[PDB]
Amino acid sequence: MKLLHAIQTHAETYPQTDAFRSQGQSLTYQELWEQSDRAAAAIQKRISGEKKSPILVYGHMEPHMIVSFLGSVKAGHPYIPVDLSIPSERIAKIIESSGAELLIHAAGLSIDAVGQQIQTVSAEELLENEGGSVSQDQWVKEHETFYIIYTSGSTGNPKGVQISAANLQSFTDWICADFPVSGGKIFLNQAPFSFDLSVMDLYPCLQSGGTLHCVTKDAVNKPKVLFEELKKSGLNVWTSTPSFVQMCLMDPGFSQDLLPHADTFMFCGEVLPVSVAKALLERFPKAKIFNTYGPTEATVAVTSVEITNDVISRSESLPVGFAKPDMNIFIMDEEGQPLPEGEKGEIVIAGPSVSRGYLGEPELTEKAFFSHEGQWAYRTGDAGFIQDGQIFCQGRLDFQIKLHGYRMELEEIEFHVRQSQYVRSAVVIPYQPNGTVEYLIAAIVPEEHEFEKEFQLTSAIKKELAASLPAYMIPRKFIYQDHIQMTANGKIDRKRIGEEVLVRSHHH
Numbered sequence: 001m002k003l004l005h006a007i008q009t010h011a012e013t014y015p016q017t018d019a020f021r022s023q024g025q026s027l028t029y030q031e032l033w034e035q036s037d038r039a040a041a042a043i044q045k046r047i048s049g050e051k052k053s054p055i056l057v058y059g060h061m062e063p064h065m066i067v068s069f070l071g072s073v074k075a076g077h078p079y080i081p082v083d084l085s086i087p088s089e090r091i092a093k094i095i096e097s098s099g100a101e102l103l104i105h106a107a108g109l110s111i112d113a114v115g116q117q118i119q120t121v122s123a124e125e126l127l128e129n130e131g132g133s134v135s136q137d138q139w140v141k142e143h144e145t146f147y148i149i150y151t152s153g154s155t156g157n158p159k160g161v162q163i164s165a166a167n168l169q170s171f172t173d174w175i176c177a178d179f180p181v182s183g184g185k186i187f188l189n190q191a192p193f194s195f196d197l198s199v200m201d202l203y204p205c206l207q208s209g210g211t212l213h214c215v216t217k218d219a220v221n222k223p224k225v226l227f228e229e230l231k232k233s234g235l236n237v238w239t240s241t242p243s244f245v246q247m248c249l250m251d252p253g254f255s256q257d258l259l260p261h262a263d264t265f266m267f268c269g270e271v272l273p274v275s276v277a278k279a280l281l282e283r284f285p286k287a288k289i290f291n292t293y294g295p296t297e298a299t300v301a302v303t304s305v306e307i308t309n310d311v312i313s314r315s316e317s318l319p320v321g322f323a324k325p326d327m328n329i330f331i332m333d334e335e336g337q338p339l340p341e342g343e344k345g346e347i348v349i350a351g352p353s354v355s356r357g358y359l360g361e362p363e364l365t366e367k368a369f370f371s372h373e374g375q376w377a378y379r380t381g382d383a384g385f386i387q388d389g390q391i392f393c394q395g396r397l398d399f400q401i402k403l404h405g406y407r408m409e410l411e412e413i414e415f416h417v418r419q420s421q422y423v424r425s426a427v428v429i430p431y432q433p434n435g436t437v438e439y440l441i442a443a444i445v446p447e448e449h450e451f452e453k454e455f456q457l458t459s460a461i462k463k464e465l466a467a468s469l470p471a472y473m474i475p476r477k478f479i480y481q482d483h484i485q486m487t488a489n490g491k492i493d494r495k496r497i498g499e500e501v502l503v504r505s506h507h508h
């Protein structure tokens with residue numbers, strides 16, 4: 001049963017059961033379906049169906065976000081989710097390359113909001129349309145794009161991963177069946193919908209008839225409020241990045257007693273530290289922990305493995321598990337040949353979860369996707385190895401990093417930093433003494449200025465970067481110098497610059 005038919009079924013059978021909950025607001029399955037059907041109708045009156053143009057859905061975790069997501073696919077348009085977290089210029093870039101002809105913001109027209117070069121409308125005024133609706137044949141289907149999520153692009157511009165219904169349906173069927181999340185449970189949603197991790201809870205919940213429960217950025221900053229919301233949520237499934245749960249764990253009160261009904265933790269998008277797993281197994285004896293791996297290009301996650309005490313003591317580094325049933329995952333050397341067990345190589349993913357590629361970016365798709373031995377495959381850029389059918393992720397081959405669960409390209413940050421009128425060159429160094437990245441240091445060659453003090457220059461640049469880059473991509477520290485060290489080849493000497501940056505670190 002297709003995701004959409006499943007959502008309609010629940011709405012027809014259990015209309016009054018809650019589908020969505022966020023900041024005191026609730027949306028029943030009937031309200032969800034009937035509203036998304038109305039938005040879908042309203043949408044077909046403002047844009048053309050000639051193309052399968054994307055529809056940006058802008059907001060945070062309002063009930064209107066999902067009502068709009070569903071409205072787009074039901075109208076026949078893939079949607080591009082955009083969090084308030086994403087700044088205006090970046091939003092302008094997504095618009096520009098996506099070809100999107102409509103932007104819906106779940107909240108009322110934000111006052112003095114940054115105007116965009118696109119037809120803009122609030123979810124509210126969309127719904128004031130007659131009680132119209134769309135016919136089943138309009139809904140997105142098969143390999144037509146369902147959603148498009150943009151991630152970091154090394155060339156300095158976000159690239160959009162196209163996830164077709166089939167893609168998602170493959171992901172959703174996998175989660176709902178092979179994980180104890182079925183049964184109409186309450187799912188937590190912490191990740192903004194602009195990140196695909198959210199999809200791990202959003203749709204398997206909707207397909208299984210569960211109730212989604214959001215915890216917004218407001219509650220996230222005020223620990224007390226958060227734990228309170230979590231306390232009342234009565235959640236059963238916890239889906240988030242390991243980083244977020246790690247933050248919660250710092251509070252001794254975060255335990256089975258705060259969440260008596262919590263029984264399933266779903267993690268993905270980043271390294272799940274043994275310490276986090278170890279700890280969770282302690283404060284939540286009634287909940288099983290799952291570690292899953294995968295890139296956005298392969299629809300959230302394609303590997304899986306329950307984390308038990310047995311597994312913890314069996315390895316210093318948690319494995320990412322066994323390949324999704326229908327997926328074919330293997331290790332390939334540089335030459336592009338399959339390696340044997342235990343031998344380190346690059347992770348490649350082939351199967352129905354793989355995205356057709358980057359929207360309007362053929363050359364990029366060209367380098368990353370390809371037809372392996374039938375299956376459509378993807379070069380993850382992750383180094384790794386398999387052992388007894390169990391996959392292990394071991395680092396990066398490129399300049400793509402993970403900072404507190406956030407995916408980003410050092411070269412993209414360098415691009416944006418280099419754009420400031422006060423910058424000539426820029427090199428971002430990630431401080432990772434051991435395994436994980438702790439923060440970023442920007443090595444900059446400034447143009448020429450009148451700023452009396454450095455902090456003023458740093459401030460000016462950082463104030464600029466806030467318009468094109470999400471806050472988490474802006475380097476914490478900024479150091480300045482005269483020249484960017486280069487190697488023989490003519491490449492940027494990142495190894496040497498890092499050493500430079502740390503030496504200057506001891507000079508106060």
Ligand SMILES: Nc1ncnc2c1ncn2[C@@H]1O[C@H](COP(=O)(O)O)[C@@H](O)[C@H]1O
Nearest residue numbers: 268269270271292293294295296393407
């Ligand atoms: N479970 C995991 N354990 C370790 N690393 C992971 C895991 N899941 C994802 N990653 C890393 O995060 C990257 C994907 O980022 P994203 O597109 O935001 O999901 C993967 O290519 C890995 O580098």
